Swiss-Prot record, chain B:
Subcellular location: Nucleus
Organism this protein belongs to: Homo sapiens (Human)
Coiled coil, from the record: none
Protein name (database record): General transcription factor IIF subunit 1
Annotated function: TFIIF is a general transcription initiation factor that binds to RNA polymerase II and helps to recruit it to the initiation complex in collaboration with TFIIB. It promotes transcription elongation.
Protein's gene: GTF2F1
Modified residues (Phosphothreonine): T114
Modification after translation (UniProt): Phosphorylated on Ser and other residues by TAF1 and casein kinase II-like kinases.
Curated annotation (Swiss-Prot), chain C:
Compartments where found: Nucleus; Cytoplasm; Chromosome
Membrane-spanning residues: none
Family: Belongs to the RNA polymerase beta' chain family.
Name of the protein: DNA-directed RNA polymerase II subunit RPB1
Parent sequence residues shown: 1347 to 1394 of 1970
Quaternary assembly: Component of the RNA polymerase II (Pol II) core complex consisting of 12 subunits: a ten-subunit catalytic core composed of POLR2A/RPB1, POLR2B/RPB2, POLR2C/RPB3, POLR2I/RPB9, POLR2J/RPB11, POLR2E/RPABC1, POLR2F/RPABC2, POLR2H/RPABC3, POLR2K/RPABC4 and POLR2L/RPABC5 and a mobile stalk composed of two subunits POLR2D/RPB4 and POLR2G/RPB7, protruding from the core and functioning primarily in transcription initiation. Part of Pol II(G) complex, in which Pol II core associates with an additional subunit POLR2M; unlike conventional Pol II, Pol II(G) functions as a transcriptional repressor.
Annotated coiled-coil segments of the chain: none
Domain of life: Eukaryota
Domain notes: The C-terminal domain (CTD) serves as a platform for assembly of factors that regulate transcription initiation, elongation, termination and mRNA processing.
Swiss-Prot record, chain E:
Family, similarity comment: Belongs to the RNA polymerase beta chain family.
Protein species of origin: Homo sapiens
Function of the molecule: Catalytic core component of RNA polymerase II (Pol II), a DNA-dependent RNA polymerase which synthesizes mRNA precursors and many functional non-coding RNAs using the four ribonucleoside triphosphates as substrates. Pol II-mediated transcription cycle proceeds through transcription initiation, transcription elongation and transcription termination stages.
Subcellular location: Nucleus
Name of this protein: DNA-directed RNA polymerase II subunit RPB2
Lineage: Eukaryota, Metazoa, Chordata, Craniata, Vertebrata
Top-level lineage group: Eukaryota
Residues shown, of full length: 197 to 392 of 1174
Gene giving rise to this polypeptide: POLR2B
From Swiss-Prot, chain F:
CDD domains attached to this UniProt entry: Zn-ribbon_RPB9
Transmembrane segments: none
Annotated localization: Nucleus, Nucleolus
Protein name: DNA-directed RNA polymerase II subunit RPB9
Main location: nucleus
Organism of provenance: Homo sapiens (Human)
Taxonomic placement: Eukaryota, Metazoa, Chordata, Craniata, Vertebrata
A GO-annotated cellular component: nucleus
Subunit architecture: Component of the RNA polymerase II (Pol II) core complex consisting of 12 subunits: a ten-subunit catalytic core composed of POLR2A/RPB1, POLR2B/RPB2, POLR2C/RPB3, POLR2I/RPB9, POLR2J/RPB11, POLR2E/RPABC1, POLR2F/RPABC2, POLR2H/RPABC3, POLR2K/RPABC4 and POLR2L/RPABC5 and a mobile stalk composed of two subunits POLR2D/RPB4 and POLR2G/RPB7, protruding from the core and functioning primarily in transcription initiation. Part of Pol II(G) complex, in which Pol II core associates with an additional subunit POLR2M; unlike conventional Pol II, Pol II(G) functions as a transcriptional repressor.
Membership in a protein family: Belongs to the archaeal RpoM/eukaryotic RPA12/RPB9/RPC11 RNA polymerase family.
Amino acid sequence: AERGELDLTGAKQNTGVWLVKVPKYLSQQWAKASGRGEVGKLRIAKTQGRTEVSFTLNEDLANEHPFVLQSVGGQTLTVFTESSSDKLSLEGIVVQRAECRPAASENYMRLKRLQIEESSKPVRLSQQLDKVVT
Amino acid sequence: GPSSQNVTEYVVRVPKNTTKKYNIMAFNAADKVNFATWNQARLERDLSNKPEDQPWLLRVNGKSGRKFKGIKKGGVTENTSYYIFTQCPDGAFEAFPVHNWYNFTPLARHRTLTAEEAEEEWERRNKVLNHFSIMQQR
Amino acid sequence: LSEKDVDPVRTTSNDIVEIFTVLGIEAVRKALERELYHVISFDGSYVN
Amino acid sequence: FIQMSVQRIVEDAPPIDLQAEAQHASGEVEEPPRYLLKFEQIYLSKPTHWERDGAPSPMMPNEARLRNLTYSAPLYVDITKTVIKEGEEQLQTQHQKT
Amino acid sequence: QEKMATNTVYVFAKKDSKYAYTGECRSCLENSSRPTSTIWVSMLARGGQGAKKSAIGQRIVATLPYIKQEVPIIIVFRALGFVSDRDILEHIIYDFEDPEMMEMVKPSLDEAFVIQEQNVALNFIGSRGAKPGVTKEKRIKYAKEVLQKEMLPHVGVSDFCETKKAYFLGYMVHRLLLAALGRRELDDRDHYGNKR
Amino acid sequence: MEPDGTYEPGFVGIRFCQECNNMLYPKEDKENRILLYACRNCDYQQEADNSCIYVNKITHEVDELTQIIADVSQDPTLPRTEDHPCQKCGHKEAVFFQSHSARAEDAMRLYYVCTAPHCGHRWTE
Amino acid sequence: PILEFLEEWSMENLEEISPAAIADATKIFVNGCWVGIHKDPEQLMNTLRKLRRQMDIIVSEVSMIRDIREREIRIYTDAGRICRPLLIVEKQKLLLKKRHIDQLKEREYNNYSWQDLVASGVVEYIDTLEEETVMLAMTPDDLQEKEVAYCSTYTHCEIHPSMILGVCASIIPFPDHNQSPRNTYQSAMGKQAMG
Amino acid sequence: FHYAGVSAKNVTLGVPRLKELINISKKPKTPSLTVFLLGQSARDAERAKDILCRLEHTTLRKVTANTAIYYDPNPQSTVVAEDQEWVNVYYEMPDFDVARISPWLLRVELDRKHMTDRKLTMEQIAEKINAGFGDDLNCIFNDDNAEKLVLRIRIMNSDENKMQEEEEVVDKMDDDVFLRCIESNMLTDMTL
Ligand SMILES: [Zn+2]
Ligand SMILES: [Zn+2]
């Protein structure tokens, strides 16, 4: 037992978790939902030889996100945590990777373009300066 | 069975704050990691640069097990985000933000290469004339 | 030149440094005149 | 060049700081004075000429050729000086237009 | 004013010199720090120490900025932190199933063996470049500063894109090696596609 | 035996080390007639399979239906042909071209790529 | 913004992968910089082309090229590339129609202009690197003739061939009945003709 | 350029030749000799072919179809089962020092058309290489009527003196690697 030792319990329990890439507006809505205890629901529907995963947004937070699964045979991921109680722990192994994609296509772009406006717009050169004397 | 028309739905929680910060620990598949052998491990900040600005040093099963170095994700998720999705006993999902992504790679054990005493000099003479014997004379 | 069945009389070169080493200064005088003669005839114009 | 590059260059990466060698041979108690300067918004008038009087006027590109002037315009920038001393005060910042 | 284009790799023949082939890459944020441009990745030719294995036309080296002498590219990779050949070759070969290329890279790995550690590899680059001094550790710091800032600045200037930079070197070796098998045609010196 | 037997004894560069992942080199055991491959920086050694460790100049890895990736067929500037019957699918529309390689070598022989999704199949003439 | 769009679309970052497990993918470059890899270049290339013609990506400042025999896609947004306007032909026909011509004649009192014409996405600016990949047709005539001709794959079309001429070679009449060095000699003398 | 016969990647023409000639250049851009032939060789194509062959500076690298290096200590159990007949063929070829030959094997494959054009024989090559490197380089070869042309090479030593007297004045050079140096030099040097 020591401060430099890592807790392996999670690893030894074979705990599996999912890793998902998501677009900024969704993370921004979750940052606006703060911690109310819901942001929406995740739905998984499997067939005879096909499995389909998706997320659907909360009506309130809005006031279908399909998931694409990615091979994990190329890299091995687990997760560790750095507690405020200074006690490091290995929580589990990453058993799945995925990417959250938008369902809207072109309209979206405008939001993005609006998003572009939000990221890109401090005043550059932009306005001469008429004529000063002092 | 129902398994061929099974529909499942879970709630998603995103707590505003957590006592512990959340990290990724990533390994190459090529590295053939085996967590069953990880009887013990240590996790300490690296010492080459001699805290929150330095790479990580991972020591498993101490000096006998494997030793790895951890480097911080150089890229930044400015247009994306990474989240962990976890199942909870109540029947819902919890999602946690990735505070950092660290890339872990094997250091070597007693491979041993001084490369300082006269190896630079021996290189001037090097005609691939020898290889085993110089490593041994240490 | 030293090889069998190669005519040791007419065998010649467009090179001049080598003609000097093997055949000696008079042969260079002839060969060098010939090589200059040869570039001039090609270009079609005649020089006296 | 005017709309992006010039503004980009002065905004970019030359913030500067300066600090005298106080507490020399002795000192103590508090402050080795330090000063920080940073450049921001940039301004560019219409082309102007200044008569010997000092009176500024609208220049015309033909007038520039017959008298041999130089058809150019004056450039001005927002500069800030930013007094965060080693303790007693962190704010005493001043806006200029230069 | 017409110039030859920036931050793009070209593989061209230079049969008149000791280099069999060269990869030139002029690197610059013509809208960034506006410093300089350099890196050459070169395939050697015409030579033989005697009974080394001989064959000089696989002995790939790299000219770096500020460095006074040519250094083998594998040494630069080992200075970036990678130590295992498979990983350098993974950075290099992608397809993994080209045994021909693997033997082509093989003498460079054979030359690497003396500096298999990062620190000494850095010190090697230091001695090849800096002024002679007993400041080994400082010399390593200087060497580190060159590879981070002065090599391929258009790839990055910070720790945070030091790994990414290693992928780009592998692309410069790959592109060079591709021209040397003849699987890819050479880049013409005077194609406007390569000018600004 | 026969001269028809292909020439691919296994060129083989990598099967590198299993421990430190560096390159293996041949080395002798005069005692058991066995080749071994050893990492130069560690004590690991293992026997080789084939006695072959190097070959040079197949002089004809004609490379006629390899490396030429099938996505080449989407290229609009390559000549589509009415010349029919891909040798796999019952559809024409082969895209064709010379050499495409600097060992051009001197080839004038055409290479044909079927362009419909049912093949991707390639073949020389 | 180009880097942003690709990152949200599908392009995997270089550190997200192990090369020996995904090296087969098409490579992506932005101003000579290797940003990542992609497993479907034809759709993405088609989409980027669709955006640039839709004005979501700055047309005059962005070139986009696919080199299919090396399975990589480089895009350039740098200054100093020479590019020219060309017509976009699709389905083996012009995308520009007579309705636009009557709209252009209308400008004597209409505010409709060349910029509107580019936004119709019937013309694109094509730089020399990209000009290496197009199948450019000399005239609409040839593009019609194609039913008997060898090529039926055109992508762009010349707005007119005499435009390959610079200012001084343009003052001179019937230049093609001139033996070619005569055209160079006039262009010089043209600067010396006083007026 | 003036197209003529087969040649004409020949003799620099004009002012560049005037500069080349008048400077007394040590390194002309295109040096040549016009060689004339005598006897039957002045009127027969095949005779001319024979003299040309003697003149043509061919090196073994130009001639070789292929090379391979094999690990085979004892021939009488060859790793290449098809080679097994030469072992039947070559058991009496210095039968004592099969106990001395190195277990590293070099194999060369030759093209029959290219070997024909030089009108060269396998015995002349074996004798040329043997004479150049010395008795140390132990060479044997195949039947000229085989459909595959092969040269089989091992390396021998001086027997008596090599018993690890001090540490073997070679500094333990790898023998495969030395065999590559033989292959490097054997091809690049041998002026058959
Ligand atoms: Zn090893
Ligand atoms: Zn087909």
